[PDB]
Amino acid sequence: LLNERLQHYTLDYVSDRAQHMKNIYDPSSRWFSRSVRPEFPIEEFLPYKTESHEDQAKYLCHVLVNLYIAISSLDIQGLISISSKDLADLKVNVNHWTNELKNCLHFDFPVALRKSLATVYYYLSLVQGQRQMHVDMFERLVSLDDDRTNFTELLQKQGLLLDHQIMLNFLCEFLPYPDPDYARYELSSKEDLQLFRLLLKHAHNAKPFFDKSKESLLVDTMNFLLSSLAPSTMMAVMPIVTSVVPYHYHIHSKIIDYFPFCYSIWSSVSANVAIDTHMYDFVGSISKDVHNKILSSEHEKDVVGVEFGEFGIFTDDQMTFMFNRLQGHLRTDGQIHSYSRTVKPF
């Protein structure tokens, strides 16, 4: 029974210690877990022998089974506690096992189990009717830099795909509704604003895993957001645009194609924090992504359509406008919210 569940979770973990250590860093191995071996071993200098990787596999399998039992019971808030008497009369807590998984994250589990957990915690973070911990768990599962190992790239190569529509609907629930009383969320309540920011962060984390084979997702999403754009909804539209729209480069449609429209709103208004943000962020993130994919030739370079010229992916007028707005911020208005994201495009 235990062996079958270990095999299902890809936790076989052959008894040979050196062979297992070589396998966990081998991309072609079944138990591939990490790309870069730590130059300084993670406290391998302890004066005593720790537990083997076989015990870690059993503990992780037990945690996964308990987490599945807890989640499948459809009691996410954990207000109901079951004892042995409750089960006996007939004839489990999501947060507890999430904390257990957070503790166990240092066991270096294989990438397939990482994909399964990433899917589980991506779809667990969007439960309604029954939250920050789940978002943090998903973010840690897809961490960009973990001992100089990019888990997002490994999960993409494993073939991890997530549903864009559920996230888009959850984000769009904050748009105005024709009937005022039947509106779950608004943008005036502090709790609603915090939930909106949390959803934006989760969407930003889950964005790279959207299906790139759906060559119409970008166009449809951008058309919907453009048709939803209005002065009474721009404060909600712009962060959604910058957080949920994936960076897809097709022959017919590219994200760069939407650059002028943003500048249309950028040059038509005065310097303000609410509008200058979501403009530096979007363009800077896109430029950094283009640069990283160009430097990732033969492994992740499919952006041959987009060139990196004199000003990267910017025209002369766009760069001049950005520099003039930056000097206006530095000398006249000071309308800068985040400085790292402001300097990223430059």
Side-chain angles (χ1 to χ4, degrees):
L1 182 58
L2 181 63
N3 304 329
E4 307 167 353
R5 296 182 177 180
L6 288 176
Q7 180 181 359
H8 186 260
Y9 289 138
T10 68
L11 297 174
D12 307 6
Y13 284 179
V14 294
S15 301
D16 191 5
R17 221 283 186 84
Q19 180 67 18
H20 175 260
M21 293 301 299
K22 286 188 294 297
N23 290 335
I24 59 175
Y25 296 104
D26 180 64
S28 59
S29 179
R30 172 181 172 88
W31 306 272
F32 173 68
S33 62
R34 280 190 175 267
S35 177
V36 179
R37 188 181 299 101
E39 301 298 326
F40 175 51
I42 310 180
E43 279 63 26
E44 206 176 10
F45 298 82
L46 301 182
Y48 49 91
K49 218 277 295 299
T50 62
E51 284 198 0
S52 180
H53 56 281
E54 284 73 14
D55 305 327
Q56 298 176 339
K58 301 181 180 301
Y59 198 84
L60 188 55
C61 179
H62 191 249
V63 169
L64 294 181
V65 170
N66 291 126
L67 180 62
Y68 168 79
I69 296 178
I71 295 182
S72 60
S73 61
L74 305 186
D75 183 14
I76 310 302
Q77 288 188 338
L79 295 181
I80 307 172
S81 62
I82 292 183
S83 60
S84 181
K85 182 182 286 82
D86 298 328
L87 301 181
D89 293 329
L90 264 57
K91 298 181 180 180
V92 190
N93 184 274
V94 184
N95 302 333
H96 175 256
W97 301 114
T98 304
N99 185 85
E100 293 287 343
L101 179 59
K102 176 190 298 180
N103 297 332
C104 297
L105 277 183
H106 72 281
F107 290 165
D108 304 67
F109 46 87
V111 189
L113 197 60
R114 195 174 202 91
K115 149 191 289 186
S116 298
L117 291 177
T119 294
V120 159
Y121 279 95
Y122 165 78
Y123 289 103
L124 185 60
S125 175
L126 302 177
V127 175
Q128 304 184 33
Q130 188 69 20
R131 193 181 207 92
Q132 209 281 330
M133 183 183 58
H134 304 151
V135 180
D136 288 9
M137 176 63 61
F138 177 78
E139 177 179 340
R140 292 183 180 271
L141 286 174
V142 299
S143 180
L144 293 177
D145 191 71
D146 195 331
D147 299 331
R148 257 52 181 90
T149 66
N150 197 328
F151 281 131
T152 297
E153 295 182 348
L154 296 179
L155 291 178
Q156 285 181 336
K157 287 182 293 184
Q158 275 286 346
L160 181 55
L161 299 179
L162 302 177
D163 191 4
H164 169 87
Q165 190 59 37
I166 300 301
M167 177 65 63
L168 183 55
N169 296 335
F170 211 162
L171 290 181
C172 291
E173 287 191 36
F174 291 80
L175 291 177
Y177 203 76
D179 210 4
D181 43 353
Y182 294 88
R184 289 283 82 177
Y185 313 102
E186 296 187 1
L187 289 182
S188 56
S189 179
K190 309 299 182 60
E191 183 181 6
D192 293 359
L193 187 59
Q194 292 186 4
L195 180 59
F196 186 67
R197 264 91 67 92
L198 178 141
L199 294 178
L200 295 175
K201 176 177 299 301
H202 198 250
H204 181 73
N205 287 335
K207 175 167 56 183
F209 297 103
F210 294 159
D211 199 333
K212 300 179 181 179
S213 62
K214 304 179 183 299
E215 304 178 10
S216 60
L217 175 61
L218 167 72
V219 188
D220 296 359
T221 304
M222 287 303 302
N223 290 10
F224 183 84
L225 295 175
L226 287 174
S227 192
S228 302
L229 180 57
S232 57
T233 59
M234 185 171 56
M235 182 181 59
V237 165
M238 276 304 176
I240 290 178
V241 172
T242 61
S243 66
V244 89
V245 178
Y247 299 154
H248 292 177
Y249 303 93
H250 308 285
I251 303 181
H252 51 277
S253 59
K254 301 180 184 62
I255 192 66
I256 313 290
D257 307 330
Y258 302 102
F259 271 0
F261 147 77
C262 301
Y263 284 90
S264 302
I265 311 188
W266 216 353
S267 304
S268 300
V269 293
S270 63
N272 186 270
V273 156
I275 52 96
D276 95 305
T277 55
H278 316 298
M279 292 298 183
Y280 287 108
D281 312 330
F282 190 64
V283 118
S285 302
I286 292 178
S287 184
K288 185 174 183 176
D289 174 72
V290 169
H291 168 269
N292 296 341
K293 286 187 175 182
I294 287 182
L295 288 197
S296 298
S297 57
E298 288 182 335
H299 300 272
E300 207 72 15
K301 187 181 184 300
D302 292 320
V303 206
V304 66
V306 179
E307 300 178 358
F308 199 95
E310 200 175 24
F311 302 104
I313 63 173
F314 303 96
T315 61
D316 201 337
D317 295 8
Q318 292 178 348
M319 187 62 58
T320 304
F321 174 82
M322 289 191 301
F323 267 101
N324 188 85
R325 202 167 191 88
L326 182 56
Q327 71 88 6
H329 292 3
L330 292 182
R331 306 197 306 107
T332 54
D333 55 74
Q335 296 289 311
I336 303 178
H337 177 248
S338 181
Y339 291 87
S340 60
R341 294 182 292 183
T342 305
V343 303
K344 182 182 301 180
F346 295 93

